[PDB]
């Protein structure tokens, strides 16, 4: 006696029911195996993508946002860049592969790694102090007190890439971590070598990400 119940006899836009085939007695062409099949959308957000760190105001050329300048003569203990770890709201991470998959969901959390690659000459040497601030803590104001937190002395003479894995990433719908980088012992080059170099930055999720509640992206206007 369930055909006269209150639920039945309506159209609900999210129902799953079988419905009559428009034309049966039709052979559907079989599927072939085509390289690369996606089955989850966390296989797109675990892929590295260049982060536009140097998106500073008064950039008159695009392609200058992916380069973080480093020069021979720069006063020691001077900040190189700052970042706020919030890949959904912060402009820096907003349009990355990671950032545009998390704007389809309303709740998410996990951990997401970063990598910093020095792209200068092969004759350059120097150091950098990459610091990290836990969420709910002010970014350091000097090189000296940014070394009393968590940090890594990256030497570009022996390494060419340094990887961080940042925990406690959440929707936060602020309190967010910070990653800052400072000059430690300038940059030193021998004769006949360029006086400027750059650092690129990559970002992706780890594998601890979880997303919940699908919703429309706020980057499309009708």
């Amino acid at each position: 006696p369930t055909m006269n119940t209150p639920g039945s006899t309506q159209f609900l836009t999210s129902d799953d029911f079988q419905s009559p085939c428009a034309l049966p007695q039709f052979d559907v062409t079989p599927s072939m195996n085509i390289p690369g099949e996606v089955k989850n959308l966390m296989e797109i957000a675990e892929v590295d993508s260049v982060v536009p760190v140097n998106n500073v105001q008064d950039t008159t050329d695009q392609m200058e946002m992916f380069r973080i300048p480093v020069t021979i003569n720069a006063p020691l203990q001077q900040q190189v860049f700052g970042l706020r770890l919030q890949p959904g709201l912060d402009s820096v991470f907003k349009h990355t592969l990671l950032g545009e998959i998390l704007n389809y969901y309303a709740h998410w959390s996990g951990s997401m790694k970063l990598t910093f690659v020095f792209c200068g000459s092969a004759m350059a040497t120097g150091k950098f102090l990459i610091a990290y601030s836990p969420p709910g803590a002010n970014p350091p104001k000097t090189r000296k007190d940014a070394m009393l937190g968590t940090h890594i002395i990256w030497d570009i003479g022996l390494q060419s890439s340094c990887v961080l894995c940042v925990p406690w990433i959440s929707q936060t719908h602020t309190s967010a971590g910070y990653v800052t980088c400072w000059y430690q012992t300038g940059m030193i080059v021998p004769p006949g070598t360029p006086n400027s170099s750059s650092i690129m930055c990559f970002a992706s999720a780890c594998n601890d990400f979880s997303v919940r509640m699908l919703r429309d992206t706020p980057f499309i206007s009708q």
Binding site: C21, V28, N54, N55, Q79, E100
Partner: protein, 212 residues
């Protein structure tokens, strides 16, 4: 998860809305006509353009209302390469190879599921090529889908009725192959990849600015 490709594109949404009046000077305003395509809904277009090949079944449900007896409405799907009507009444509506639904008002909405129809092994959202060889860029006929024509069923004497048809569309049993990076520019056409260059991201102020 809700992150599966199946559930990502499994949502149902409106895709076409049009009206027709039974008695009108124009004969093209006595019936609905609608080429099926997924390039008319801006919101859903971006979600289907993150893949280069898709394979799915369609489920189409119609919501009809009328304004001044019982009113009946034919809903005819024309498979690609079938006859197409050019008049309110002609032999193209009497064809026996075009599925039809005769639905009366005051009943649960009409629905039918059109299978995967294509002689290729997948639909292609992007096609870089020509049709004849160098009104031809970026169009192939393998990703072509049918048409839907409504038309209010009535006697030999028509009577004024104005109706509004809404079409809802849901991909079903989706499989997807080869990622693409999400769209960055606004769509300027309904059948082209035409665009106007846009900035990469919104400017900050200084590289050391990290204020919330």
């Amino acid at each position: 998860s809700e992150s599966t490709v199946e559930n990502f594109l499994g949502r149902s949404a409106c895709v076409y809305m049009e009206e027709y009046k039974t008695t009108d000077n124009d004969v093209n305003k006595k019936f609905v006509a609608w080429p099926i395509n997924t390039k008319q809904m801006v919101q859903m277009r971006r979600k289907l353009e993150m893949f280069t090949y898709l394979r799915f079944d369609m489920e189409v449900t119609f919501v009809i209302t009328s304004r001044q007896p019982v009113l009946t409405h034919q809903i005819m799907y024309v498979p690609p390469g079938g006859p197409i009507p050019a008049k309110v009444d002609d032999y193209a509506w009497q064809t026996s190879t075009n599925p039809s639904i005769f639905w009366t008002e005051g009943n649960a909405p009409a629905r039918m599921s059109i299978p995967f129809i294509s002689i290729g092994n997948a639909y292609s959202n992007f096609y870089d090529g020509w049709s004849n060889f160098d009104g031809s860029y970026g169009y192939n006929t393998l990703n072509n889908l049918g048409h839907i024509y409504v038309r209010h069923v009535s006697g030999s004497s028509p009577h004024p009725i104005t109706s509004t048809i809404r079409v809802y569309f849901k991909p079903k049993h989706t499989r997807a192959w080869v990622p693409r990076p999400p769209r960055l520019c606004q769509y300027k056409k309904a059948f082209s990849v035409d665009f106007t260059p846009t900035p990469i991201t919104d400017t900050r102020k200084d590289i050391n600015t990290v204020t919330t």
